[PDB]
Amino acid sequence: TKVVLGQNQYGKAEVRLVKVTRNTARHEIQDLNVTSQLRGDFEAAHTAGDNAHVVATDTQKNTVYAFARDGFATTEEFLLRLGKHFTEGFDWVTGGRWAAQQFFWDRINDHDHAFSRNKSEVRTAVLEISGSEQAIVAGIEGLTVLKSTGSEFHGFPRDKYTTLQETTDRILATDVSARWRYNTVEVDFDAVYASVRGLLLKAFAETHSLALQQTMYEMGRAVIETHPEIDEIKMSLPNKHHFLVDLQPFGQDNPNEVFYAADRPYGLIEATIQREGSRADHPIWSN
Amino acid sequence: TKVVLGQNQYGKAEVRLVKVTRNTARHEIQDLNVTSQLRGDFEAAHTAGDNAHVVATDTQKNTVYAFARDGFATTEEFLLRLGKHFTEGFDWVTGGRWAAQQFFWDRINDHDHAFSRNKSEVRTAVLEISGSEQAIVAGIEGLTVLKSTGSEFHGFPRDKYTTLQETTDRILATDVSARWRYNTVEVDFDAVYASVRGLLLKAFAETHSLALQQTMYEMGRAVIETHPEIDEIKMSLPNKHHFLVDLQPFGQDNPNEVFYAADRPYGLIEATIQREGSRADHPIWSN
Amino acid sequence: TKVVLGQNQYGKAEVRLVKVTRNTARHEIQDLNVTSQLRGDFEAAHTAGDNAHVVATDTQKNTVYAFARDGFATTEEFLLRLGKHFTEGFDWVTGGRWAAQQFFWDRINDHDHAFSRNKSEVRTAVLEISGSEQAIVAGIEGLTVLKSTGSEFHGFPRDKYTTLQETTDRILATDVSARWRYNTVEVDFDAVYASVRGLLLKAFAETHSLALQQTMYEMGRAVIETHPEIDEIKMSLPNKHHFLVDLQPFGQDNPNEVFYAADRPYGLIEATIQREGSRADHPIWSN
Amino acid sequence: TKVVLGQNQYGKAEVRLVKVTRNTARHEIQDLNVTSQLRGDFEAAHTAGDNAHVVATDTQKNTVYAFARDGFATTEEFLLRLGKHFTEGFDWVTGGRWAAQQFFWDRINDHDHAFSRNKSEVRTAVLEISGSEQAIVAGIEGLTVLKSTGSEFHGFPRDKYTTLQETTDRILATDVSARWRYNTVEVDFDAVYASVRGLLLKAFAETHSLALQQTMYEMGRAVIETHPEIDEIKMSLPNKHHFLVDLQPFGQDNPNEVFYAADRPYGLIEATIQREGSRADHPIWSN
């Protein structure tokens, strides 16, 4: 009977931007995939189609490029400028969500202006503004890692649907997806990103895994213990199964050497590791 | 300082199941992509690698196939059985999230056991159990629609970054992604899905759009006004731009006939249409 | 020592075009993904970077849109116009390859100007011109089909690496990728495409399969025998494995009802079915 | 007319294999995606469904894993072993096509058994056997490169549909897809692949480009001039457009700094650079 407009947001998604810094002959590249969405009083736009408050998504797009001209120190700094502009430049806009994927490039043999894409990982940044409050979540994704040994899985319950054999030596492969929330905007974003990445990789490799859950816990612990500016880190790790192929039918044995890497299904272990006392239901995780 | 394990879940994702009903010569096909994740007391698994509480993801997978053998009337009913099994079958498992994508098949010339895939839309379902509470969200995605006319966009604010021209005749194209939450388990799931789908399509097609936000609002309103078992519907609609090509440089006009369908960027309009007074932020939307 | 420039072609790939026919209130939609590439004397362009002979890819793109303005009866007709234009408009351009994917749309409840995408298949067309000769290849792809029974596979040889068990009842699922070459440009392209599509589906469903190879042969035979204008048809059919899950570990039998649909690996059966006495290696197949 | 079975092949595609070398504590990882297809007398299999000659695709898959157990120096030598096995093991199998993609892994902090994927490129290998002839084509794909300056495009003809403006400074970005055919199987496959990769990257970066065609020719020439064992190299290079955004409407200039990286359409430049006198159309290119 009675319908009500609830949470809503709109903007331009996936604006691909490449910013070349060329004041000197030593060029620099910043490659981003930017998304901008605004929140506020858009009631009339939905109920009546009145666009008085609707800053065109095309305009949001143009702004991204116009602002890039001035350059930016980091992806987070760029998003902060965009969010401030939209929330303060329009009275009916009270907040929003600005996000970006950053793609890395490497110089070709140290060339001044020739590069090749480093596709081994994608960096992410998300900024959410709510009234006078703002929060930033940085992250990494697409980083595939694997341990050929030093992984075990045993001691799990065995019901009538259990057939998995316990093992003290298996491959542990996953795609590192992690996002962490800063408790302050005054951060050396690039330095922390590189640090976290290294801590996650180190924790994954050096931890004698008794379960993906434990490896993940150790990865998150390393981050929280190293960075006071991070209140929590969320990780989503798939267990990309590498099955030890049965070679007995061919008169052979398989001493943990030949594996079939299955696409699906895959285990999916996810968890939030946080600083004792910190918030557990921050709105930025709602998207 | 003190590190703590927060929210967490784990299970098997993307178990591809195809259930053939062949008690009669008239075969039926059910094609699903199932994901099962458990929630409960998994503290020791994360902090010590103690897997006593860890029902193997492989076991969760086995359960999916064993349960499918008995058959299921609908995807939602299937997920309901899985959820009750894990929560009730293990004391330390207090809840979870079970989801599925349903893929449609049509018979080949009404053949008894020959079919072709209908890839024009994917049906989804998600069940979340939290203690004694159960919540179900059904949805539809991948349904691309387009109106060649009957779409306008004007009256939006113009700042120094606005270059978009107002229009009273443009193409409106989007991919319908919609999710709605049920307020009861006693629903004719298949019948409601077919109805919601038709209402969304009907509203999109019949509404003289003054904005994508308005079209979306009308789509949601129709669903809520029609089904008492639905408390809210969320939609994420991309505005897939079809640019009217300028052929004037060649001395040709273009009366809304020739368009360039750009990939990215795209407008992204999202909103929640709720039954007045219903829950504001149900946990199921968090994931 | 001595390096020579061999075969070469260039142009604009994937020009997304949507042509709306709206002379009457009953709108029509033609949605294409067009690729244009030219062949001829481009020696200097490659060896010296002299672009006198290089019709810009941007120009080829503009030409696609300019020509679309006049409309076109079929995709093949449209490609024929483009091919003729480039080969006759430039003396150094002696031929080329023009291709297109055609996407289908259905009216939403028979509405005059509102449609939804039919993603169950994609139609293709390729025109190749070489001097005074030209050839057209039409095709279909992305059409997934499945037989729940009426498929067998036994009688295959066994060696030390063979573990496969014979069967007289299995699921036969594949993706229909087929391409046929016309022996003349005087063809009712839309009618033949529809007919061919129907012949492939009919043969797939009605042939009691003893092998995917056999089914494929029957599909090709039906097409060649029905259409005089077709000299040969090439097919690439993956055998998408649907494994009958073993439920005995759970105390249940599985009377051909519960299957695991594996992504990879997959059988890949390919063959060319030809009209006796036709060309055996037409250049259009090289691409 | 009669219907005839023309060219045909069948086998198992995309068999994902991971081979771990672990004789010492210093583990090595070989990651491949293997495809096996046989050629020969399969007439009966197609026309009568007689599978006496049909070595099961499942058997081919098993053979890949069994052979993997013995280890292999390079991907090409692995394919050679497989190819010789099937052709020499079955009288009716006269040849075939074996291919593989090789995925790279780097150690995490020089760890003995912990690695991360290098996704910046994918190495490929294709072997075709025809009687006693063994033809091998190695290649690289997915390697995206970009030059921020040192690229021009002018002097092209301006026909009635040309709007592109001449320029002496633009971004040149592409995805390096190259394949080269060896004229002998006695090659240091890993060394040549590394050399070729370096030569392509070098030519791309150091060539002052007047056209993508020129940059490509120079890349191919460098390879042929350096490797006697290579008879020809084919390249397929997309011109991934990075449009210099017009910020003048916002009162700003854009000195080659802010770009929009478009997805489609894109220029597609392709060519074959051969050693003078070598085979014009080796059958392996048909696939």
Side-chain angles (χ1 to χ4, degrees), chain B residues 241-245 258-263, chain C residues 16 65, chain D residues 260 264-265:
Chain B
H241 306 129
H242 281 61
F243 296 104
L244 187 67
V245 182
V258 182
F259 304 80
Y260 154 45
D263 293 334
Chain C
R16 289 284 290 110
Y65 288 120
Chain D
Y260 155 49
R264 302 184 294 173

Side-chain angles (χ1 to χ4, degrees), chain A residues 3-280 282-286:
Chain A
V3 164
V4 176
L5 202 212
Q7 299 176 299
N8 67 83
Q9 54 182 40
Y10 81 109
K12 191 72 94 190
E14 305 199 66
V15 174
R16 290 282 289 105
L17 171 288
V18 171
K19 175 62 173 63
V20 178
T21 296
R22 61 145 79 190
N23 32 63
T24 70
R26 188 68 168 178
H27 294 190
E28 300 292 309
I29 301 297
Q30 282 174 115
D31 195 336
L32 307 177
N33 190 196
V34 184
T35 289
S36 167
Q37 291 186 109
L38 311 179
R39 294 165 179 170
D41 174 31
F42 301 122
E43 184 70 43
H46 293 81
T47 61
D50 179 15
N51 302 307
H53 293 343
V54 187
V55 178
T57 63
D58 187 77
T59 297
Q60 294 185 50
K61 175 194 67 176
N62 294 338
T63 304
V64 168
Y65 291 118
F67 279 14
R69 169 71 180 83
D70 302 307
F72 42 104
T74 63
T75 302
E76 287 90 331
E77 186 185 78
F78 187 60
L79 296 181
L80 280 165
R81 183 183 177 195
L82 291 172
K84 180 176 178 61
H85 168 75
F86 289 113
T87 57
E88 286 169 43
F90 303 96
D91 301 317
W92 59 78
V93 176
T94 60
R97 187 184 176 86
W98 293 272
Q101 282 172 151
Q102 167 165 24
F103 309 111
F104 302 115
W105 291 82
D106 296 313
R107 294 175 185 286
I108 295 175
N109 279 55
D110 197 50
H111 193 292
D112 281 356
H113 57 261
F115 318 77
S116 68
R117 265 296 303 294
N118 168 7
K119 303 180 178 179
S120 298
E121 71 189 52
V122 176
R123 172 175 171 179
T124 63
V126 180
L127 163 71
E128 271 215 2
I129 294 178
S130 181
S132 61
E133 180 219 301
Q134 76 189 333
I136 290 184
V137 169
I140 186 169
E141 64 196 16
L143 183 50
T144 303
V145 299
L146 175 165
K147 294 194 65 177
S148 51
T149 190
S151 177
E152 304 181 40
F153 192 55
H154 50 72
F156 47 95
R158 305 189 71 78
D159 66 13
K160 81 166 194 166
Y161 297 112
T162 300
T163 58
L164 181 63
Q165 298 300 293
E166 297 184 308
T167 182
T168 56
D169 195 345
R170 67 173 182 179
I171 280 183
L172 178 63
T174 188
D175 295 317
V176 179
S177 279
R179 279 170 176 54
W180 54 90
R181 179 173 68 75
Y182 293 118
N183 53 212
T184 172
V185 294
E186 61 179 62
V187 184
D188 182 326
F189 297 114
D190 287 344
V192 177
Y193 172 88
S195 174
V196 174
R197 172 180 176 287
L199 289 169
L200 294 176
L201 252 14
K202 176 184 173 63
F204 175 81
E206 312 186 327
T207 300
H208 181 73
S209 186
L210 297 184
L212 210 192
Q213 286 92 329
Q214 185 195 198
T215 292
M216 176 174 64
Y217 180 77
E218 289 302 312
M219 290 163 70
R221 189 177 79 187
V223 179
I224 304 300
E225 293 178 351
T226 299
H227 298 88
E229 59 282 42
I230 295 177
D231 262 11
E232 54 174 340
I233 179 169
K234 296 194 171 186
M235 292 162 286
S236 179
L237 307 180
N239 200 323
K240 326 228 299 182
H241 304 132
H242 281 65
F243 294 108
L244 190 64
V245 185
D246 181 23
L247 303 180
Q248 184 183 190
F250 321 124
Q252 299 172 132
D253 69 339
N254 191 357
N256 304 301
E257 277 176 42
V258 182
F259 305 81
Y260 153 56
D263 296 330
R264 302 185 295 175
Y266 50 95
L268 186 55
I269 281 57
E270 317 189 89
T272 302
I273 306 310
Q274 60 204 318
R275 186 179 301 291
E276 169 180 283
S278 64
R279 187 170 184 177
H282 194 99
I284 198 166
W285 298 117
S286 293

Side-chain angles (χ1 to χ4, degrees), chain D residues 258-272:
Chain D
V258 186
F259 307 79
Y260 155 49
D263 297 337
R264 302 184 294 173
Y266 50 96
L268 181 55
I269 284 59
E270 323 187 83
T272 305

